[PDB]
């Protein structure tokens, strides 16, 4: 966890999140349920699609081996040809293995950044009207119905609307 979101202060994944990498869970008087974040998931799909298409194109022009025959009096030429092909196959094998290892580290860290950004996006929008529990969840100081919950999910929270009500309950 390079960004501390996955397996960090959010120590467990959700099995109910079936239609997206990232999302929200809300619970109020009306009910509770999950909701995936389609915008952030779509952005993640764009990087992975380009990242894989990048891998294919680069090794598209990889060295190709052709069989040759040499007589018993051409040992130096045969050995020279053998070391050329073996050397090139070793260079390209190293590149293929290293690229996969390096991209896997990036991909896992990229997903970790998305949750931290999504957690911060909600936090900086609910500045004072909620209470931060520290486990990836926010607890409201006012009444937040389904229309209020949906505003948080799509980044249209009206802080001044609940500013007065929240501080009355927060103080006492």
């Amino acid at each position, epitope marked *: 966890g390079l960004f501390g979101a996955i397996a960090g202060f959010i120590e467990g994944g959700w099995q109910g999140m*079936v*239609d*997206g990498w990232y999302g929200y869970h809300h619970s109020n008087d009306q009910g509770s349920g999950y909701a995936a974040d*389609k915008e952030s*998931t*779509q952005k993640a*799909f764009d990087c*992975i*699609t380009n990242k*894989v*298409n990048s891998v*294919i194109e680069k090794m598209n022009t990889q060295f190709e081996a052709v069989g040759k025959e040499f007589s018993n009096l051409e040992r130096r030429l045969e050995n020279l040809n053998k070391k050329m092909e073996d050397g090139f196959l070793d260079v390209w094998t190293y590149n293929a293995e290293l690229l996969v290892l390096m991209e896997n580290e990036r991909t896992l860290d990229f997903h970790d950044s998305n949750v931290k950004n999504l957690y911060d996006k909600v936090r900086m929008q609910l500045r004072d009207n909620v209470k931060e529990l520290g486990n990836g969840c926010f607890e409201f100081y006012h009444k937040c119905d389904d229309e209020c919950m949906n505003s948080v999910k799509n980044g249209t929270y009206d802080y001044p609307k609940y500013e007065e009500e929240s501080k009355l309950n927060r103080n006492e």
Partner: nanobody, 120 residues
Framework: QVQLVQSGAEVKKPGSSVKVSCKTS????????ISWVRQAPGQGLEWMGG????????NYAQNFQGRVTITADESSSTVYMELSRLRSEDTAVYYC???????????????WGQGTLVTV
């Protein structure tokens, strides 16, 4: 350069099922949702259902719930449709449409398959 290839034309009888496939190229793994829409001759296009790219979640139209089953295999990047309990007026041309995103909602059909003619 993205093309969707479907199965061939099929002839069926009422009471049987149909299996229409749609293979998508242009990448190792499928990244866009694929939906199925049909056109009965003399009638307009109707939406049947679709499947999310990786998570495999499927949504079906209320008209065809309980009769259509869309499944995909991540290994081969193929999407199949299973319309069962064939009856009259099920003769139509079925297309597989690729969405602009990974999800069915808020996405439009970038590309369409050539179409398959199925008669009962």
């Amino acid at each position: 350069q993205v093309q969707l290839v479907q199965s061939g034309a099929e002839v069926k009888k009422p009471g049987s099922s149909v299996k229409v496939s749609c293979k998508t190229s242009g990448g190792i793994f499928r990244s866009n949702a694929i939906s199925w829409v049909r056109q009965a001759p003399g009638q307009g296009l109707e939406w049947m259902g679709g499947v999310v790219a990786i998570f495999g979640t499927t949504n079906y139209a209320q008209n065809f719930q309980g009769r259509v089953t869309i499944t995909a295999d991540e290994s081969s990047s193929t999407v199949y449709m299973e319309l069962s309990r064939l009856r009259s007026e099920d003769t139509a041309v079925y297309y597989c449409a690729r969405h602009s995103g990974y999800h069915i909602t808020n996405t439009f059909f970038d590309y369409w398959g050539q179409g398959t003619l199925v008669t009962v």
